[PDB]
């Protein structure tokens, strides 16, 4: 037999539901998302890092021409200059007094440290949320992992868990991101081949070991304007490093919904957003016939003092009368309240005390024991502590957040107003009747 329920997409929170297998005694079902793994689809665009300018040893044909031929190196920008008459440490270094042409060369490659200091830009799209589930139900507990696409069954043991799609489409990563040393930054990096001199993407390649390097750096070579041989040149400050100095802060401190961003592969861990549809086929052998389980003839709810808060600040008690001892399930059918306990070893007769949490000051919810239903009605107070170390175990509905008394006052004031317009209609009728009754 299969069951299905929506589940709040919040990590660590144990969601709880009751499966009402018809003639079988109900069974508790706590759905607990151990962790979430929103994996974006990604492709490497290019590797980049601090370009290491390489100016190869100059070439000189002291009495003739030199070709300014092309080469495949990144931003290969060689130029030829005459009258160089360069001096080396040993002295003059050319055949001719005047017609000495000199070839100056410059290109760039990844610095040696780039093997670690590099960053990779990646386009990312259509992120799919993976999740780790731990399911506990009756005397049985199981753990599972599933891609929440609404199609794949991440089945394990006997649980035919199927999950998704996500109630809201979301990704923390924008379609352009850059990964560095495990950090990541959303950044509209320039496209492959779009190297801009002095900005991120100054030098680019498909792999850091690759010779297929393309770059733009505004490298320009000046005349050897000194007697000592030299190759004076200038260029834009490594755009990669310039970016680093002003990169903005990473997504680990910018991703919403508290999702902790992680790399290798780039993925978002523990995201908390929307809700997860869940369906679970369970082997009927996990349930029991209603005659085998105990069942309660009579039950009533008396709520103790309670606090509406993220934690189990509420406490309630139930008197019960049962046919026999055994583990009855206990659950709240109302969405605005969840019980801490999920099972009770019911006696033939007695009472149980249960802890619960609620977001509505009106503790107005229907508790169930062994499938029987009991209404609870109490006024919870606000907690004395403004901030606590635990997320709210339940959402809130504004229609449910109005207190029984505040709701009565509102409906009494609008009732008054509506009674005055009703009196209006009454008198507007009777004013016609005054004429028509004695015409």
């Amino acid at each position: 037999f299969e069951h299905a329920t929506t589940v709040p997409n919040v990590p660590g929170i144990p969601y709880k539901a009751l499966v009402e297998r018809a003639g079988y005694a109900p069974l508790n079902l706590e759905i607990t998302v151990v962790s979430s793994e929103l994996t974006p689809s990604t492709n490497k665009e290019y590797v980049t890092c601090k370009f290491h300018t390489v100016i190869p040893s100059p070439q000189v044909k002291c009495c003739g021409s030199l070709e300014c031929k092309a080469s495949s190196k990144a931003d290969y920008t060689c130029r030829v200059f005459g009258g160089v008459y360069p001096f080396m440490w040993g002295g003059a270094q050319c055949f001719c007094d005047s017609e000495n042409t000199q070839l100056s060369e410059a290109y760039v490659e990844f610095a040696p440290d780039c093997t670690i200091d590099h960053a990779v830009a990646l386009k990312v799209h259509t992120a799919a949320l993976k999740v780790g589930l731990r399911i506990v139900y009756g005397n049985t507990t199981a753990h599972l992992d599933t891609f929440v696409n609404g199609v794949t069954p991440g089945s394990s043991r006997d649980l035919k868990v199927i999950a998704g799609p996500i109630s809201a489409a979301f990704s923390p990563f924008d379609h352009k991101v850059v990964i560095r040393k495990g950090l990541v930054y959303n950044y509209d990096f320039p496209e492959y081949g779009a190297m801009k001199p002095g900005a991120f993407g100054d030098i680019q390649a498909s792999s850091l070991d690759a010779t297929d390097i393309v770059a733009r750096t505004d490298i320009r070579l000046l005349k050897p304007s000194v007697k000592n041989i030299h190759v004076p040149y200038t260029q834009a400050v490594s755009g990669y490093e310039m970016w680093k100095n002003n990169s903005g802060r990473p997504l680990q401190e910018t991703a919403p919904f508290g999702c902790k961003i992680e790399v290798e592969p780039l993925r978002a861990s523990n995201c908390a957003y929307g809700h997860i549809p869940i369906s679970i086929d369970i082997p009927d052998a996990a349930f029991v016939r209603s005659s085998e389980s105990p069942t309660i003839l009579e039950v009533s709810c008396t709520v103790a003092d309670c606090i509406y808060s993220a934690d189990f600040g509420g406490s309630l008690t139930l008197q019960y009368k049962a046919d026999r001892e055994g583990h009855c399930p206990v659950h709240s059918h109302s969405t605005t309240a969840v019980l801490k306990e999920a099972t009770t070893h019911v006696t033939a007769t007695g009472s149980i005390t249960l802890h619960f949490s609620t977001s509505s000051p009106q503790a107005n919810f229907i508790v169930s024991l062994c499938g029987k239903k009991t209404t609870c009605n109490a006024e919870c107070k606000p907690p004395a502590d403004h901030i606590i170390g635990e997320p709210h175990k339940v959402d809130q509905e504004f229609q449910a957040a109005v207190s029984k008394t505040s709701w009565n006052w509102l409906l009494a004031l609008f009732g008054g107003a509506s009674s005055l317009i009703a009196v209006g209609l009454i008198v507007l009728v009777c004013s016609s009747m005054l004429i028509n009754t004695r015409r």
Binding site: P256, F257, H386
Partner: protein
């Protein structure tokens, strides 16, 4: 590599707001984000005693 852990920040709790009491001898990168739809990304190099 070992890195310091400045004296644990003494949090003060108030209505829908927290006051972090801070004490750092060297620049400490305090960073926070809201788990809401908006992240409200915040980062500040705190120095000295402050809040």
């Amino acid at each position: 590599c070992p890195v310091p852990l400045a004296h644990t920040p003494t949090v003060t709790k108030w209505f829908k707001g927290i006051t972090l009491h801070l004490t750092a001898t060297r620049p400490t990168l305090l960073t926070t984000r809201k788990l809401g739809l908006r992240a409200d990304a915040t980062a500040e190099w705190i120095t000295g005693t402050t809040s």
